[PDB]
Symmetry: C2
């Protein structure tokens, strides 16, 4: 398990290529991580509300120290983080 | 005044430098535009729901064909466009 800040992608990225080759899709359950293999499944828990989702890694970044994962819009909805923008999260590779 | 398609920055970009030099802050009321001066204040109206907000220009882009402005996360929330991703907008210089 690891911990850090989560963010979510803006829609300005929708349709643009991720590092995995997939075009970023706000409706997918995808995320960026610096090192996990593409396709890795990760349980993300928002430590502010205890909501959790499972995402699939398809991109690189994040781009700031202290930020551990960037998730899709749909994942952010599942995490209850749309209004907060960011949240402290636990992550666990599955 | 002009009309065109808008998208938004989320929080993935938070902390990264804009073309104006300031770090992008998803909680600020800001936007990227190709031509308006940095510091320009504009009213952005979502033409689908008629919501409006005021933002200041602090970045350059979108460098996507078929988009006229990319607003901050907080602005997108105010415009009701988080889920839609894109929205038709009018921009009016103040």
């Amino acid at each position: 398990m690891d911990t850090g800040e989560a963010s979510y992608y803006g829609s300005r990225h929708a349709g643009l290529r991720t590092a995995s080759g997939e075009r970023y899709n706000p409706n997918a359950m995808t995320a960026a991580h610096r090192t996990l293999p593409f396709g890795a499944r990760v349980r993300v828990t928002n430590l502010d509300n205890r909501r959790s989702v499972v995402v699939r890694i398809n991109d690189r970044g994040p781009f700031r120290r202290g930020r551990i994962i960037d998730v899709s819009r749909k994942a952010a909805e599942g995490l209850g983080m749309i209004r907060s923008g960011v949240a402290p999260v636990r992550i666990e590779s599955l």
